[PDB]
Structure formats: structure tokens, C-alpha cells
Design a protein around this ligand. Structure first.
Ligand SMILES: CCCCCCCCCCCCCCCCCC(=O)OC[C@H](COP(=O)(O)OCCN)OC(=O)CCCCCCCCCCCCCCCCC
Ligand SMILES: CCCCCCCCCCCCCCCCCC(=O)OC[C@H](COP(=O)(O)OCCN)OC(=O)CCCCCCCCCCCCCCCCC
Ligand SMILES: CCCCCCCCCCCCCCCCCCCC
Ligand SMILES: CCCCCCCCCCCCCCCCCCCC
Ligand SMILES: CCCCCCCCCCCCCCCCCCCC
Ligand code: SF4
Lengths: 102, 100, 478, 300, 162, 168
């Protein structure tokens, strides 16, 4: 066809023009003008929680685009998935893993 | 249009590179990095195989593989932090107290 | 495939263990109570164990493209649940001395049991991979549960790194197999081939990388070097679980894979597994000679016993009683390892701090712990294949299976390795009976568990017919 | 000279026009928020000064990471804007992934804060960047989950399918909790000012500081346009031409962000973490469940 | 379409080779992110749109963020990493590189002897992945949730501070 | 070329971000300068103008020197008040007598304190000084401007009568 390849050309031109724009912006900035504590473990914990819940979110991303095709069976399966996810979240909240204030 | 053997060869190359990085590095962090490279190469191989047969099982195996990658990375980095806490170094030759 | 309510009846132990995980986690979120959460974990495991009967009433069928439930699945689900219950029972007296949190142990034991059940019911490469990882990652937590102890952190790091590498090998091999086959079901691995074209190179290489991952998980030579270090460094109930349930579930799913796959009777794969089994038997018996530590000795023992099981697995395509032999040997090895690692767990409990030792000191045990010494010497005689013990019944089954299929090198390997095992097991037993210079009902429950295991080993060694009858009753879908 | 080549060149020109308009609106609305709290000549003067300022990379810092953080902070949300349809026939890429590409760009955009923190080489700056990165992780944990109700109602990841499914009713009415959670998440991951500081912009001078400034305002433009196309019909309207409706709704949401900055105080860091991990994430999950129940219940 | 595959595969191989040989952990992780983007482009060139989307969302947007976070928390200012360069000595890397090259030769020899009709690159959308994920493969979904919970509990228990 | 340098200096003069590092009463006058009744409308790394407004003590002088060194070219300095110009009324042991002892100053403001309109007048003076000089376009000759004293001499000497102090 022609519309899809036209949109591919438009998107490729968009990406290369934006990247070249930022690169030449830095090039002009660098080219023009004269010249003359202990890291707490809570950051790792919240980053790891983000990783795990992002993988569970990816499963829900896959489900959400085909809810009608899976029917009520898929709804029950996803409800079990979400309930396990929420039980893990409640567990993390209650053991103080997500509490930052002392 | 893309041969299946070419995608499988690419995945094998990346798996071999990840295994080499896992072996030759004394630092625990680069060993975890090599593990991530190996499991991502295996997941890429599953995607290539699924796209060859036109089946949706390859991306499902990719999803399970990256779930394993995320959880193993989490556990390995927690162990790395514990090792750095209680020994102040990440050289894996020093973690050899059990032998024989 | 959809899920009917009868398929949910066939899904029963998996559902009960998952609901147990959720309930235990919500109870921990309510209040950290060690006794209540341990009680909930063992109640859920007992509920799954007794729901195996309702699974048996339903019948053998397939619940998914992934899971297939039959008598084989019920048998190995029961073995995994027994090992998990024993692990919780041994873990409570050890965890009573653990000053940090104690209930995450039971949560991880439940998740690892769930992985074992999935591996028992597996009929698919996806379910095989997911069951292996579902076993492995709670073991990453449990092996280094006492991470303040130096050896436990070392064993956790070693097991995590090596098991991630093995999972990568297994995943890449499954990907190559799926590239060749086009279906991930066990029955369709090599089905498209025929008329002598079974030894396709990509299929064989994928099965080789799968064999690398599985032989890591089964402590088979040359993927065996982690086993004494991880067994020694891990906590003693973790050593019990890792010796029994992980090996049993993974060997069950390997038996299913080599039974259902049309490429499982390949001559090249058979010869490779014969080499691996021969080397596993000989090396795991030879390396346990000069072992003064009971944990490393039991690790090399695990290597040798898994080699004997592999010998039984090689004759699966030729013989017919190979599944029965594997079931009898697995029950015997389960009870033997449960008793031995339970004696080690009871004498190392409570956990006496991260800065102190975790040694067993088996010399002269009979003069202050006579019942544990009797249990441990029965277990050492059982692991040696000596008659009047169930380990001999397993070894007899393995030898009968190997003789039936004319695997003469493996028969000689079993004989030689059995003699070397006789040496080091008897050294351990006489060290128990030489001369050397609790007070709660959960320690009593652990002692009752190891005593019942000893009585089961002795009775089923002198009378193995009930075990053979209940193992032959567990036939999978032919 | 062929009509297909004419169409290809016209589509390329449309893409370049969209890019120049979104960048120019980012700079112009940067001056607009500067003046609200002539003038294009002042903006051009500021751009000239940023061009001819002495570009200084610190001696005790990395070059690649320090250079790459503003590049990410600009290009990530620019390419996030690359999926937004502004009119029928006026779109850069009619991707099948769409909002997945937006999530890809946000997940790449956290690296700008992380890399600015590493190249700062200051303990206070590194700690502040760790706090900022933990905040944007805590609030991008539910960004896709807030958009999943809209995706479920559309049944697809395509943005044109979403705005066509918003034909009878705009998605702000059914997906209201999804709307407020997407608003909070987009505010927090673009570092708007109820959540601007828990700074990592220190040691950035001249063109890199300008890149951070223009990049975050371009992210404001992108999030406003995505809010329009995901919850307020996109281009759809009763009387006006479609681009006029899209532009007025987008400008309304940019002014709404200005009012939000001028009208709200700064919550404490612990409150921000507790909110993002205790309220918004379960609200997104419950909203997705209720949306699925209503979708399966109505389609008998 | 094949040009995108070959260019992104070449970029992925080169970036991986730069990963396993670099000494600065931040530059190694940056090269790893570049390789993950290249592999996502490979996925998009094969029709696996959902796989490439998750390769940038999860692998390059969550896992590498965690690695970057750990590298920050280690405060690596030359803490027994940059000074050694022990892996560049040929007595350390020549053996394992030979071993991995032998393994690559064996695997490629296995791969080259398979029937190949080519990859058509027909886009398998995320709708089909969601249909088969919550149809035949749904026990995998539930037990993968259990696997992620296991990883969560393990990493929380190990990676506390106290 | 000629118009290009003019546009560059125009861009520099129409966009000036002050780092108002004040230390005393003069700084409080500049705080009052930001209110809406005067209508006058950061970090030293991106600021291009340093307004030294207050007494330069012997202990605060290293801070002022370091904060000026952290700035980047082009950089301009406005001294506000008698203290920053000369030390003012504090010819005392603990005061540096003028900030131009250690950093160059482009525009001086007399007063103690100057009112904010004097600061706006100095901003206009600095803008004219910027627009009259020229710097290299890519990788400094300041213009010698006529002094405000002699320029304003005629209209100052022409003053005859002033309102008496008795009334208001
Ligand atoms: C610092 C910068 C470093 C360098 C960054 C990369 C620079 C070059 C990037 C552009 C390369 C040229 C253009 C490539 C092709 C574009 C068109 C395209 O991807 O089309 C394929 C596909 C179309 O599919 P669709 O239209 O949905 O379906 C119809 C039938 N297929 O559409 C898709 O599959 C769309 C999904 C792929 C889109 C990729 C977008 C770029 C990804 C990299 C972003 C980097 C961000 C900055 C760095 C982050 C931190 C390191
Ligand atoms: C160096 C810069 C990056 C170079 C690699 C990426 C761009 C390679 C060239 C792509 C050119 C466009 C192209 O090949 O489009 C074909 C196809 C379009 O989609 P499809 O529907 O399959 O079309 C076939 C018939 N219609 O395209 C596709 O199906 C896939 C389109 C390409 C894949 C998405 C973009 C990948 C970007 C990867 C960037 C990696 C990081 C680069 C870092 C550079 C600096 C080190
Ligand atoms: C043959 C299978 C195992 C049978 C039981 C093995 C022994 C169990 C313990 C029974 C009691 C042993 C008493 C030993 C006393 C030793 C005294 C030595 C004195 C020099
Ligand atoms: C160390 C173990 C030695 C085992 C020897 C077994 C010998 C088997 C010979 C088989 C010959 C088969 C001929 C047909
Ligand atoms: C903040 C708004 C950003 C918009 C970015 C894209 C701009 C595209 C402009 C297209 C204009 C023509 C649209 C078709 C004609 C219908 C409208 C006519 C009256 C303007
Ligand atoms: S010049 Fe006068 S008003 Fe200004 S700081 Fe000095 S004493 Fe204060």
C-alpha cells in the first residue's frame, strides 16, 4: 500500500528530525560562545516494588485489550490475579515496606 | 523474508556473549548483568521461534521469561546489596569459604 | 482449553496451596504471629494432601494445554506435599531461635510446594519452565534465610547465580526445541519427524541445553559442584526441602518429558543420559569418602541417588516397570532423606545466632540422643541399599530395571557405587555409636516425623508390597 | 513525480509541522507561565543567550551521562507526543501499540533524572535525585494501569480507535478515577509542581539547563494532548473544526496545569510515597475490574 | 523490514560485546540499555509488537532502572573495580572465550541444519497475546503472579537494612 | 556579520538572570524590589549577573569569591550601595573595603541603601554597556562608555530651585 508506508516515512522523519534537533541543539551550545552519606535501602526496596508491580501491570496490559474476547472466565482469572496482587500490596504496606515515615 | 536460522543465530550469539560475561567477570554485578543478557537472549529466541510459526506462544514464553528475569534480578541485587553491606566488596573469589 | 468445574476439581491441590499462600500472607499482614502462620501453612498443606483423594475421584484428564492430572501427578504431588510438611515441621524449632522475621519462611515453603505441584501436573514446556522457576526462587530466599550467617549468604549467592544460569540454559534449549517442533506440548516434541529422522540436530541441541538445566537441578555430573556447598550453607530445614522436594518434583517432570516425547527414545539422548548417570553414580560416591561434614556427605549422596534414578529413567522407553521403579525409589529416598536431614535439623535447632556455628557433631550421639541416633543409623543403612530397608527395595528395582534393558555398564556402576556408599555410610553409623567427650512439642513433632520415617523405612523394607501396590496404582496416561 | 510521492511528501510535511508546533508551543508556554506568574522577542533573546552561553562540562564528572540526561528529558516526551492524533488524517504514526509507546517513552524518561543524579557528583544532589527517581517510579507504577480502563473500553491500543470509541460519550465520564489517576501520574512523572522537588538541575548550565526546561514543558504539552485524546474525545466536537477543538482542549489543560502549580502546596515526601503506593494503585486496579465488569455486563 | 532486523541485530551484538568488556558499570549498563532497545527493534521487525513494547517497558524501563539504582547505591568511585582490569589479561579471558566460541559453533551448526521457510513478519498484536494468555495459558498467568510474589518476598527479606 | 553580533548582544542584554547575593540591608531593599509596587520584572551556574549588595566582610569574602568563580562567561557584576563599592562607612578591621578589591565590577550604585529604582537604572546602564561592547562569537574588548556624571552634568547644574524641607 501507500498510506502505511507514507506513515512509516513520516514517523521515521519525525524520529530522526527530533533526535537531530536535540543533537544539533547541544552541538550549537557547545560550539558557539567564547571560553575562559549512607544510602538507605528503602530506595532499592521501592525500585524493586516498581519492577515487580510493573510486570504484573504488563499482564494486566495484555488482558485489557481483549476483555470481551475472554469473557467472564477471563474476568474471573484476572480477578484472581488482581486479588493476589492486592494481597501482596496490603502485605507490603502492613509490614512497613512502603512506610517511609518513622 | 527473514530466515528463522538468522534470528536463532542472533539469539545464540547473544546467549554466548552473556555466558562469557558471566564467566570472565569477578565482580558480582557484571555476573548479574551477564545473567540478564543470557535470559534476554533466550527470550529473544522464543520470540523468533513464535514469530516463525505464527503462533502466539512465543510472546507468552517471552512474558514468562522476562517475569523470571525481573524476579531473578531483584533477588540477585538484594543479595549483592547484602554482600556489599557485610563484606564491603563484591569480588566473588572472596566468597569461597565452603569447599572440599 | 477452557476450565470446567470438574477441571477445577482436578486443579484442587494447586488451588488450595495458592489460597494458603494468600491466607498466610494476609495473616502476616494482620499480625506477625509465628505459631498461627506455621499452623495455617501446615493446615493448607494437609488440606491439599487430603484433597488429593477428591482429585483421584475425578479421574485422569487434561486441565489446560499445560496441565495433565493423573495418578502419576497425584503421586508426585503427594511426595512434594509430604516433603513440604516435613520442612515446616523441622523449620519451626529452627526458626524459634531466629531473632528476625520467621513467617516469610512458611510463605516461601508454600510457594515452592506450589511449584512442585505444578511440576507434578506438567504436560507443557511452559508449565515445566514455570514450575522449575517457582521451585527455584523461594529456594533462593530459603537457602539464604539466615543471610547474616556467612556460609548461608555464600550458599544463597552461589545457588542464585548458578540456578539463574541453568534456567537460562533450559529456556534457550526450550526455545530451540520450539523452533524445531512448533508446539510446546510434551507429546509434540519430535512428532513432525519420522522414519529415522528423529535425530534432528536442532531438536537434539535444544534437548541438550534443557538437559544442562535439568541436570543442574538434579545435581547430575558435571552440573553437581554446587550441591555440597549449597547443602552445607543452607539452613537445615532448607537442606531437607532442597534434597527432597526439589529433586522429586524435577525428576517427576523429567520422567513425564521423556515418557511423552517422541524424541525421548533417541539413541543419542539415551547414550548422553547413560554417560551422565554413570559419572553421577561414580563421582557422587567417590567424593563422599573423606567427608567429615554430614551436610556435604548427604549432598554427594544426593548426587549418587539421583544417578541411580537416572539409570531407572534410561530404561523407560525399553522397559515398562521403569515408572514403578522410579516411584518406589523416590518414596524410599524421600523417607531416607527426610529422616537424615531431620536428625540434622533437630540437632541444629534452635538457631543459635548468626555468629556461632551450625555443625552437627555426629560422634557419640547415642549416649545423649539415643532415638535420633537410632533414626540416623537406620537412614544411613537405608541410603546404603542394605536389606531390611526401603532404600534396598529401591536399589533392587533400579537393578531389575537395568538388567531388563541390558544396561550392563549402569549395572556395574550401581554395584561399585553401592560399595563405596557402604563404606562412608557405615563410617557415619559407627561414628554415631562411638564415644564422645527441646522441651516443646514442636521439637517433639519433628522427632515424631523422623521416627515415623524410620519406622516406614524399616517396615517397607521388610514388607514392600503396600508401596508397590500404591505405586503401580499411579499410572499416567499411556 | 507521482501522486503517491506527493502523498508521502505531504505526510512528511505534516509530521514536521506537528513537531515544530509542539516544540514552539513548549517554548511559548514556558514564556507564558513565566509572564503569568510582545514577548516572543524576549524568548528569542533567551534562546540566543542559551546558544552563546559557555557550555561547561564539569571536570570531576562523566561526559556521556551528563550530556545524555537532557537528551533523554527532551526526546522521551517528544517521541511520546509522536503518537497523538490531532485531526482525522493528521497523525505522525498510526501505531498499533499507541499508549504502549507512551509507556515506553515514560520508562525511558526516568533515566534523565537518574543520569542527572549520577553526573551531579554531589551527595545532597545524588540523594535528592534518588528521592526524585523513587517518586517517579512510585507514580509510573500505575500510569498504564490508569490508562487500562480506556484501553479496555476501546478494546484496542490504537489512539484513533480510542477517540472513535469516545464518539457518544467522552471517557472522562466512565473512566473518571482513571482520569484522576492519569492526571496525578502524569503530573508526578513530568515533575510538575506539587511534586517538583522532594535539586538535580544544579551544575547544568546554559544549553543543558535550557534542554531540561524546554523538555519538561514539552512533556506538559504531551501529557495535556494525551489527556485530551484519552479522556475528552480527542478531535471530536459538535460544530467547530476538529483541530480547533483539540487545540482548545489542550490549551485548557495546559492552563489547568498552570493553575494546579499556582493553587496547591507541597505535600511531604512520605505523604507522596504513601499516596502513590496506597491509594492510586488499588484505585487503578479496582477501576479496571469495574470497567471489565461493566463491559462484559452490557455486551450480553 | 529485513534491513531493520539486520541493523538492530548488529547493534545488539556490538552493544553486548561492549557490555561484557567494559570496566565502568554505568557505561556497561548504558550499553546494555542500547542492546535492549536494539533487541526491541528486532522484535518489532518480526511482528512481535507486544514483545518489543515490553522489552522497552519492562526490560529497559524497569530492570535496568533497578540495576542503575544498585550501581548508584554502591557509590562506585573506584571501589576495587576500575583499578584491576583483570579480565583483559588473556590468561583470564582467552580460555572462556574459546569455550564459548566452541559452544557457539556447535549451536550454530545445529541451527543451520533446520528447515527454514522464513519469517513472514505478520504482526501478532497484543490482542492475540491477551486472548491466548487468559485462555489456554492462564494457569501460567496465576502461577507467574505467584512467582513474582516469591521474588518480592525473597528480595524484601534479603535486602532490608535494619 | 555586523547584524549577527548586534543580535547576539541584543539577546544577551534582553535576557539577564541576576544572582542577587546580598548580605545586609541592601539585600532587604532588593527583597522589597521584587514586589508588585516596584515591578522589577536561581543558581550561580546558570546566572549571568551577580549583584553584590551589602558589606563584604573578611569572612564572607571567600564565599563571594567562590560564588563568582562558579559563574560562567559572559558574567557581569553590579555593586549596590556604599559597602559593596568602597566599604562604605565601615572603614574597620573586619570589612573588606569594596568588593572590587577581589572581583571586577561592571556597574556601581551609590547609596546606603539604594532604592530599587536605582537598581533598575543600573540594569539599564548594564544593558547599554552590553549592547555597546562586543565579544567573540565562537571559541574580550569592553566599550569605554561615557561616564554618567559628565553626561548628566548639564541637566544637573541647570537646577536652580528645590522644594523647601518645611512642607511635604
Ligand atoms: C539518544 C538517542 C539514541 C538513538 C535512538 C534511536 C534513533 C533512531 C530511531 C529511529 C530510526 C528510524 C525509524 C525507524 C522506523 C520507524 C517506523 C516503524 O517503526 O515502523 C514499524 C512499526 C509500524 O507498525 P504499525 O504502524 O503499528 O502497524 C502497521 C503494520 N505494521 O512501528 C513500530 O514498531 C513502532 C515501535 C518502534 C518505535 C521506536 C522509537 C524509537 C525508540 C528509541 C528511543 C530512544 C529514546 C532516547 C534514549 C533513551 C535512553 C537511552
Ligand atoms: C542507529 C539508529 C537506529 C538504527 C536501527 C533502527 C532503524 C533501522 C531502519 C528502519 C527503517 C524502516 C523499516 O525498515 O521499516 C520497515 C518495517 C515497517 O513495518 P512493517 O509494517 O513491517 O513494514 C513492512 C511492509 N509494510 O519496520 C519494522 O517493522 C520495524 C521498524 C524498526 C524497528 C523499530 C525501531 C528500532 C530502534 C532501535 C534503536 C536502538 C538504539 C540505537 C542507538 C544508536 C547510537 C548507538
Ligand atoms: C538393620 C536395620 C536397623 C535396625 C536398628 C539399628 C539399631 C537401632 C538402635 C538400637 C539400640 C542400639 C544400642 C547400641 C548399644 C551399643 C553399646 C556398645 C558398648 C561397647
Ligand atoms: C566401574 C564400573 C565398571 C562396570 C563394568 C560393566 C561391564 C559391562 C560390560 C558389558 C558388555 C556388553 C557386550 C554386549
Ligand atoms: C497545542 C496544540 C498542538 C498541536 C500539534 C499539531 C498541529 C497540527 C495543525 C494542523 C492544522 C490543520 C488541521 C486540519 C484543518 C482543520 C482545522 C482548520 C482550522 C485551524
Ligand atoms: S551600603 Fe548601607 S544599606 Fe547597604 S549594606 Fe552597607 S550599611 Fe547596609
Amino acid at each position: 500500500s501507500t498510506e502505511v508506508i507514507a506513515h512509516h516515512w513520516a514517523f521515521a522523519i519525525f524520529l530522526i528530525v527530533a533526535i537531530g534537533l536535540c543533537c544539533l541543539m547541544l552541538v550549537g551550545g557547545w560550539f558557539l560562545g567564547g571560553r575562559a552519606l549512607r544510602l538507605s535501602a528503602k530506595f532499592y526496596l521501592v525500585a524493586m516494588f516498581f519492577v515487580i508491580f510493573d510486570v504484573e501491570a504488563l499482564y494486566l496490559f495484555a488482558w485489557s485489550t481483549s476483555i470481551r474476547e475472554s469473557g467472564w472466565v477471563g474476568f474471573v482469572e484476572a480477578a484472581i490475579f488482581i486479588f493476589v496482587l492486592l494481597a501482596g500490596l496490603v502485605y507490603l504496606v502492613r509490614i512497613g515496606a512502603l512506610d517511609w515515615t518513622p | 523474508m527473514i530466515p528463522l536460522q538468522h534470528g536463532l543465530i542472533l539469539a545464540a550469539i547473544l546467549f554466548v556473549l552473556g555466558l562469557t560475561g558471566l564467566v570472565i567477570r569477578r565482580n558480582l554485578l557484571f555476573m548479574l548483568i551477564g545473567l540478564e543478557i543470557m535470559i534476554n537472549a533466550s527470550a529473544l529466541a522464543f520470540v523468533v521461534a513464535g514469530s516463525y510459526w505464527g503462533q502466539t506462544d512465543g510472546q507468552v514464553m517471552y512474558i514468562l521469561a522476562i517475569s523470571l528475569a525481573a524476579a531473578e534480578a531483584s533477588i540477585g541485587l538484594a543479595l549483592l546489596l547484602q554482600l556489599h553491606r557485610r563484606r564491603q566488596n563484591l569480588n566473588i573469589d572472596s566468597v569461597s569459604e565452603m569447599r572440599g | 482449553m477452557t476450565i470446567t468445574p470438574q477441571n477445577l476439581i482436578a486443579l484442587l491441590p494447586l488451588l488450595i496451596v495458592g489460597l494458603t499462600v494468600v491466607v498466610v500472607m494476609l495473616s502476616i499482614a494482620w499480625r506477625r504471629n509465628h505459631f498461627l502462620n506455621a499452623t495455617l501453612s501446615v493446615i493448607g498443606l494437609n488440606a491439599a494432601l487430603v484433597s488429593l483423594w477428591f482429585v483421584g475421584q475425578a479421574g485422569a484428564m487434561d486441565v489446560t494445554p499445560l496441565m495433565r492430572v493423573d495418578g502419576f501427578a497425584m503421586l508426585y504431588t503427594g511426595l512434594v506435599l509430604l516433603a513440604s510438611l516435613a520442612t515446616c515441621t523441622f523449620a519451626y524449632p529452627w526458626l524459634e531461635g531466629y531473632n528476625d522475621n520467621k513467617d516469610e519462611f512458611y510463605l516461601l515453603v508454600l510457594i515452592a510446594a506450589l511449584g512442585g505441584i505444578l511440576l507434578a501436573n506438567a504436560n507443557h514446556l511452559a508449565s515445566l519452565f514455570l514450575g522449575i522457576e517457582l521451585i527455584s526462587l523461594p529456594l533462593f530466599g530459603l537457602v539464604g534465610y539466615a543471610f547474616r550467617q556467612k556460609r548461608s549468604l555464600e550458599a544463597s549467592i552461589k545457588y542464585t547465580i548458578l540456578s539463574a544460569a541453568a534456567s537460562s540454559f533450559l529456556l534457550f534449549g526450550m526455545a530451540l526445541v520450539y523452533a524445531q517442533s512448533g508446539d510446546l506440548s510434551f507429546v509434540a516434541l519430535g512428532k513432525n519427524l519420522g522414519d529415522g529422522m528423529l535425530n534432528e540436530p536442532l531438536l537434539l541441541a535444544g534437548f541438550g541445553l534443557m538437559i544442562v538445566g535439568l541436570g543442574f537441578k538434579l545435581s547430575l555430573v558435571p552440573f553437581h559442584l554446587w550441591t555440597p556447598d549449597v547443602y552445607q550453607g543452607a539452613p537445615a530445614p532448607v537442606s531437607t526441602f532442597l534434597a527432597t522436594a526439589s529433586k522429586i518434583a524435577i525428576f517427576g517432570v523429567v520422567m513425564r518429558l521423556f515418557l511423552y516425547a517422541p524424541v525421548g527414545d533417541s539413541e543419542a539422548i539415551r547414550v548422553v543420559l547413560a554417560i551422565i548417570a554413570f559419572a553421577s553414580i561414580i563421582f557422587g560416591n567417590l567424593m563422599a569418602l573423606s567427608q567429615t561434614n554430614i551436610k556435604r556427605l548427604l549432598g554427594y549422596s544426593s548426587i549418587s541417588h539421583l544417578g541411580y534414578l537416572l539409570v531407572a529413567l534410561i530404561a523407560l522407553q525399553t522397559g515398562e516397570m521403569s515408572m514403578e521403579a522410579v516411584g518406589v525409589y523416590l518414596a524410599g529416598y524421600l523417607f531416607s532423606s527426610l529422616g537424615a536431614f531431620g536428625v540434622v535439623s533437630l540437632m541444629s535447632s534452635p538457631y543459635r545466632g548468626p555468629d556461632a556455628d551450625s555443625l552437627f557433631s555426629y560422634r557419640g550421639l547415642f549416649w545423649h540422643r539415643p532415638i535420633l541416633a537410632a533414626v540416623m543409623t537406620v537412614m544411613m543403612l537405608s541410603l546404603a541399599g542394605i536389606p531390611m530397608t526401603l532404600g534396598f527395595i529401591g536399589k533392587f528395582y533400579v537393578l531389575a530395571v537395568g538388567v531388563q534393558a541390558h544396561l550392563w555398564w549402569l549395572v556395574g556402576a550401581v554395584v561399585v557405587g553401592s560399595a563405596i556408599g557402604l563404606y562412608y555410610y557405615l563410617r557415619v553409623a559407627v561414628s554415631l555409636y562411638l564415644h564422645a567427650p527441646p522441651s516443646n512439642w514442636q521439637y517433639s513433632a519433628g522427632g515424631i516425623v523422623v521416627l515415623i520415617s524410620a519406622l516406614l523405612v524399616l517396615v517397607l523394607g521388610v514388607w514392600p508390597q503396600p508401596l508397590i501396590s500404591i505405586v503401580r496404582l499411579a499410572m499416567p496416561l499411556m | 513525480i507521482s501522486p503517491e510521492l506527493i502523498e508521502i511528501l505531504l505526510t512528511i510535511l505534516k509530521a514536521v509541522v506537528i513537531l515544530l508546533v509542539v516544540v514552539t508551543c513548549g517554548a511559548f508556554m514556558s514564556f507564558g507561565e513565566r509572564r503569568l506568574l510582545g514577548g516572543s522577542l524576549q524568548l528569542v533573546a533567551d534562546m540566543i543567550k542559551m546558544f552563546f552561553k559557555e557550555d561547561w562540562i564539569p571536570k570531576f564528572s562523566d561526559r556521556v551521562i551528563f550530556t545524555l540526561a537532557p537528551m533523554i528529558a527532551f526526546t522521551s516526551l517528544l517521541l511520546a507526543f509522536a503518537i497523538v492524533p490531532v485531526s482525522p488524517g493528521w497523525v505522525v504514526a498510526d501505531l498499533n501499540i499507541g499508549i504502549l509507546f507512551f509507556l515506553m517513552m515514560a520508562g525511558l524518561a526516568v533515566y534523565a533524572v537518574l543520569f542527572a543524579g549520577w553526573s551531579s557528583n554531589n551527595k545532597y544532589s545524588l540523594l535528592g535525585a534518588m528521592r526524585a527517581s523513587a517518586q517517579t517510579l512510585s507514580y509510573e507504577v500505575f500510569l498504564g494501569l490508569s490508562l487500562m480502563g480506556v484501553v479496555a473500553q476501546a478494546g484496542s491500543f490504537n489512539m484513533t480507535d480510542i477517540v472513535n470509541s469516545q464518539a457518544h460519550v467522552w471517557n472522562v465520564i466512565p473512566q473518571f478515577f482513571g482520569f484522576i489517576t492519569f492526571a496525578i501520574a502524569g503530573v508526578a512523572v513530568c515533575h510538575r509542581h506539587p511534586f517538583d522537588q522532594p535539586g538535580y538541575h544544579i551544575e547544568y548550565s546554559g544549553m543543558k539547563f535550557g534542554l531540561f526546561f524546554v523538555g519538561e514543558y514539552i512533556g506538559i504539552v504531551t501529557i495535556s494532548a494525551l489527556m485530551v485524546t484519552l479522556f475528552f474525545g480527542g478531535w471530536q466536537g459538535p460544530l467547530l473544526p476538529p483541530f480547533i477543538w483539540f487545540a482548545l482542549k489542550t490549551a485548557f489543560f495546559m492552563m489547568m496545569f498552570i493553575l494546579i502549580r499556582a493553587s496547591l502546596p507541597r505535600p511531604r515526601y512520605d505523604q507522596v510515597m504513601s499516596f502513590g503506593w496506597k491509594i492510586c494503585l488499588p484505585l487503578t486496579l479496582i477501576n479496571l475490574l469495574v470497567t471489565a465488569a461493566v463491559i462484559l455486563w452490557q455486551a450480553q | 523490514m529485513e534491513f531493520a532486523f539486520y541493523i538492530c541485530g548488529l547493534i545488539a551484538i556490538l552493544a553486548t560485546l561492549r557490555v561484557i568488556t567494559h570496566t565502568n558499570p554505568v557505561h556497561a549498563l548504558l550499553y546494555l540499555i542500547i542492546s535492549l532497545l536494539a533487541i526491541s527493534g528486532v522484535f518489532f521487525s518480526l511482528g512481535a509488537y507486544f514483545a518489543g513494547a515490553l522489552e522497552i517497558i519492562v526490560y529497559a524501563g524497569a530492570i535496568m532502572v533497578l540495576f542503575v539504582f544498585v550501581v548508584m547505591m554502591l557509590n562506585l568511585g573506584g571501589s576495587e573495580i576500575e583499578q584491576e582490569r583483570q579480565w583483559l589479561k588473556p590468561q583470564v579471558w582467552i580460555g572462556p572465550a574459546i569455550l564459548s566460541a566452541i559452544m557457539l559453533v556447535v549451536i550454530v551448526y545445529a541451527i543451520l541444519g533446520v528447515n527454514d521457510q522464513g519469517i513472514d513478519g505478520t504482526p501478532i498484536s497484543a490482542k492475540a497475546v491477551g486472548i491466548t494468555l487468559f485462555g489456554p495459558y492462564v494457569l501460567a498467568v496465576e502461577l507467574a503472579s505467584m512467582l513474582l510474589l516469591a521474588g518480592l518476598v525473597v528480595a524484601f527479606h534479603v535486602g532490608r537494612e535494619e | 556579520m555586523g547584524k549577527l553580533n548586534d543580535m547576539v548582544n541584543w539577546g544577551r542584554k534582553n535576557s539577564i538572570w541576576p544572582y542577587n547575593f546580598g548580605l545586609s540591608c541592601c539585600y532587604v531593599e532588593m527583597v522589597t524590589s521584587f514586589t508588585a509596587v516596584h515591578d522589577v520584572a536561581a543558581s550561580p551556574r546558570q546566572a549571568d549577573l551577580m549583584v553584590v549588595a551589602g558589606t563584604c566582610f573578611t569572612k564572607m569574602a571567600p564565599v563571594i569569591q567562590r560564588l563568582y568563580d562558579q559563574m560562567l562567561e559572559p558574567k557581569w557584576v553590579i555593586s549596590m550601595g556604599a559597602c559593596a563599592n568602597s566599604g562604605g562607612m565601615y572603614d574597620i578591621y573586619s570589612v573588606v573595603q569594596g568588593v572590587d578589591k577581589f572581583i571586577p565590577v561592571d556597574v556601581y550604585i551609590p547609596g546606603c541603601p539604594p532604592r530599587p529604582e536605582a537598581y533598575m537604572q543600573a540594569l539599564m546602564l548594564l544593558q547599554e554597556s552590553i549592547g555597546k561592547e562586543r565579544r567573540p562569537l565562537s571559541w574580550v574588548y569592553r566599550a569605554n562608555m561615557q561616564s554618567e556624571r559628565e553626561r548628566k552634568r548639564g541637566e544637573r547644574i541647570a537646577v536652580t530651585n528645590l522644594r523647601t524641607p518645611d512642607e511635604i
